[PDB]
Amino acid sequence: STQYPVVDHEFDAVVVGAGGAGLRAAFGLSEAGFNTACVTKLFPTRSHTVAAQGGINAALGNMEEDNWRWHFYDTVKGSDWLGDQDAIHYMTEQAPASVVELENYGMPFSRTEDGKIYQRAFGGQSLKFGKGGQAHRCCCVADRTGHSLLHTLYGRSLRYDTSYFVEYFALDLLMENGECRGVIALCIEDGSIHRIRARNTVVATGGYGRTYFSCTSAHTSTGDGTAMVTRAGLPCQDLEFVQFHPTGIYGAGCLITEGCRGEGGILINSQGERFMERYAPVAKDLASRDVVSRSMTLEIREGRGCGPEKDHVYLQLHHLPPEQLAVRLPGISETAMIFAGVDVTKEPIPVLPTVHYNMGGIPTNYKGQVLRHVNGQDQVVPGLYACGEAACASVHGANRLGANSLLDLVVFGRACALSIAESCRPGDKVPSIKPNAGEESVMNLDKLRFANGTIRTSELRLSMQKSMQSHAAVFRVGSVLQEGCEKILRLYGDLQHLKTFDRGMVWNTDLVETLELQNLMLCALQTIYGAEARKESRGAHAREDFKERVDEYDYSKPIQGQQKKPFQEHWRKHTLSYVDVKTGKVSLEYRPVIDKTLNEADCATVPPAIRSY
Amino acid sequence: TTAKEEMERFWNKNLGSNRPLSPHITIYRWSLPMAMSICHRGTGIALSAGVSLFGLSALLLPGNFESHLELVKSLCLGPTLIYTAKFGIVFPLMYHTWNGIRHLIWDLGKGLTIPQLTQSGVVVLILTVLSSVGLAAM
Amino acid sequence: PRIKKFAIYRWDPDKTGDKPHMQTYEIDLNNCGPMVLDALIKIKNEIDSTLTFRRSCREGICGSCAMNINGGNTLACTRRIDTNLDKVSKIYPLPHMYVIKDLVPDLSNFYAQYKSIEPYLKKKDESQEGKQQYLQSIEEREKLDGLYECILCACCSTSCPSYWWNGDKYLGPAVLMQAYRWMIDSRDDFTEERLAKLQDPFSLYRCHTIMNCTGTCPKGLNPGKAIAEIKKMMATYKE
Amino acid sequence: SSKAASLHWTGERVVSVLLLGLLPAAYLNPCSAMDYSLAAALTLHGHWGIGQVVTDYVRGDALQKAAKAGLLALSAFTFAGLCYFNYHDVGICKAVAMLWKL
């Protein structure tokens, strides 16, 4: 307002995010002939997908003969039947074409005797629809596959004339009468404010792992796009479903890949007994990620910890040949030595279940279109898309399969570009935004720039992180969750009391991290409130007071002659969460999961069954 | 926006700003490889200055070489000071010669690891002193 | 209690007539992580929230926190603090770079150089791409090891004295190693053209084998060796 | 697509190994024929060497062209001076021989 410069831009499409999803969508749009902008708070390479270690799943059938439908079955089974099968059909069928594409882009996949892309075993995957044993369809660039995926995508991105707004912090969506018009953003370099308007917007901001005190995710996983959707009054989905990766280092919380266990790595308790052989008889320590970490957390509780505090578990690798470890896992071998002082070929690595992936996010079509929920029915938000960890097409549902997100990224990034390319043409009328639009975001920015309160940003962040870590961990109960809720709600009241120090325009990290805090809180509130309301054990969400898996039927017995439960009586449904930004209260609704696939004849629906590995 | 355009805009941005250059030589920690690179330049420049001065004086200055040697035996001093004159000439030559061989081995693609640098660096340094003592005594 | 001092380069662009200066912070190592980034975060969170620096992955694969620590270019999240209390850690931005603010250097030129070598797979016939995986043998793949792992942290290039004096016209270690990365990739069909793009006095030939790049690279890579290997290709390639 | 930058580089290493071979060759076989080769090698290697120093430090298209001209002249005078020495005086090899037994 006369102290802030406003620069208006005009584009066909805006992508908010520069990770796997963000990039693939960005240049995918430009390839289709669209004048595209890409808004990112980091340089694209710095994006989290660089940290990815395991691999990207595709039923290419390079190790043994494979079928993509077998990958479909494994994903839906893993999703604990909260996964939308229309989107899972689409992802797994496209999987081979998407991974071949990447290799053709220049991704340096590890190779075989045949010269084809090397795939490996990974947690939760099987052949012949579960019956035919362990599957090997995890395509990987040694231990640094996410790094390679991001670097080739960025490499490829330079071939097109996409406009990259590097180190620009997206504040809010430009929204007019329910329709999305673009984004308002802060230029970190000079402190200027940029209204970037387009016919279509793609949100690919990734997850919000930083809501917790212990996470494998980067300092920049602050669910910024999630909060942008929230402030628009739109719903988020399944936010209470937080994946705890079994193998995260005991020190800084750094990730050690599931590829360790997929190559032959084992998990060991205090007594030395291979404990994962007891919880999962068939799949063992190569079971689903919700189940493996559940057992690890359980082992600590009955005194089988592996330290001076007795609070972790060992990941054994020294039995595997040294030449195998150096080729298949060069990345973790370095980080285990750096962060824990551990030689992997001699000593085991201290691991602990820590926050990893967010299967919740922005509700979405199999086409990548953001959904609002009106009159108990689904409704497409015009000109708003979302893909990646930020989205929730719920291709992962209640629990994500390992090595499926890097796929989730590449597939639905492409899908967003295709859905735009098929619904409109480049050069179409860019809708006209109001002259005073995005005023609240600038006012929010200005309030936080001069914020002279009593509680420091970092102190309030730590309060939130420790509150989530102890009230909403692997296991949770009604009472602990309810005390967590009214504590997180009290901490939202502390956002009017926050203190900031840096009062500059150029690179005010003090300010952007406080913006990140507002975003994280909105993500935290919806996670904890949705968690306490859900009274069942499904996937990563485990209630000790509600051990049972509550569906429309009791799927343990035959379906023949049984009475179907009403919608508001069972729990096989998506959580839709809203929060009034002023008061900070959480109101929530629910929508049905999609069981029907894209084609029954090509890919049959998989009904709910007993969930165990 | 092309790569060429980004560079052209980078330099326009920074030169017309109050942005300071981050310290470089005043802060970066010394190492033998780097110090031996500087000496290879110095020894190179010094030697070229020598060859030029020797050639230029042959064209511009009167008399012959035999005459100029007799001129050194004027207010001359002991063999120790003559040894110093020979050592001062042969030292930068030998250094540049050995370190130059090391440069050529590098161009073949060999010995280019951090342990190998420190080794071959010391080997050149030792070979310089020995061949400088050896030649000055002939 | 166990106190450790930190001398850090500070410059504010919004402060009128402010010149570059050093600021010292005192940190108890019993309440801090083992790495230097932990310290920087701790003094940001508790002492001074004006200290501006780049960070993300915290595990040393994003390359955001690249800076000069104790006269050497590394990543703050991988360099462990010297538990020697009598010594004071000196933290500077990457050498010979325009300072945006504090320890945040302008890397946009660096990135632009990377763009100009075209770091993507190029085929002569591209009408078949996206439907069949390209074949690459285990040996042909091994050639990439030591090269593809690059993080683009810019430590090496910023350690190169040739890149200090001639960073405008000379591509530097990082970008050059990446040109080599695509040169010996068996799937690439533009080997000859990529070499020809370096046929001038500056692009490649400002390297004088100073070898500061290899000695500083936080990921253990050897760009100097790759530059040496490029030079050998330039002299030997036909047509 | 001319390749002068790579040829110049190869040229440099070629005269480097030439000059390295010449120093002991001059010691073992000190003659007039070696004196001119040594004059050719010394001047050329030095000329290209200083050339690199100039291209590294001398900033500006105007100044660099001038420095390269001033180097060209200095190198031209150097090679002439040595050849004049070899023809009219005692020659490089014999000159070092005299100077060293002093």
Ligand SMILES: *Cc1cc2c(cc1C)nc1c(=O)[nH]c(=O)nc-1n2C[C@H](O)[C@H](O)[C@H](O)COP(=O)(O)OP(=O)(O)OC[C@H]1O[C@@H](n2cnc3c(N)ncnc32)[C@H](O)[C@@H]1O
């Ligand atoms: C944490 C993690 C996850 C992970 C993994 C290893 C680690 C340590 N390994 C994986 C693997 O081996 N295989 C696999 O299938 N998945 C693996 N994962 C999970 C997966 O990698 C992540 O879910 C995925 O990388 C998410 O990627 P996405 O494309 O959604 O984007 P991102 O990496 O999270 O980066 C976010 C981008 O958005 C921009 N951003 C964020 N907020 C803003 C705002 N405020 N304004 C502008 N831009 C914003 C960031 O700049 C970034 O580019």
Ligand code: HEM
């Ligand atoms: C026979 C012994 C010699 C050998 C093996 C040799 C070799 C070399 C090599 C390989 C280089 C390039 C180094 C690089 O890559 O930066 C070089 C540089 C140079 N040399 Fe020699 N040289 C010798 C003698 C001489 C002599 C007698 C002179 C005096 C004219 C001389 C003058 C120079 C100069 C001025 C440079 C450039 C310095 C630089 O750019 O770092 N060299 N030498």
Ligand SMILES: O=C(Nc1cccc(Oc2ccccc2)c1)c1ccccc1C(F)(F)F
């Ligand atoms: O001058 C050269 N190095 C140089 C010049 C000045 C400073 C410096 O660092 C330091 C930094 C700190 C302490 C000591 C040296 C290195 C140099 C030497 C041989 C070949 C090419 C070069 C040149 F490319 F031109 F850079």
Ligand code: SF4
């Ligand atoms: S070669 Fe090393 S120092 Fe250079 S950009 Fe890559 S990781 Fe960084």
Ligand code: F3S
């Ligand atoms: S520091 Fe240097 S001049 Fe060459 S060998 Fe490495 S780029």
Ligand code: FES
């Ligand atoms: S912050 Fe990711 S490299 Fe240090």
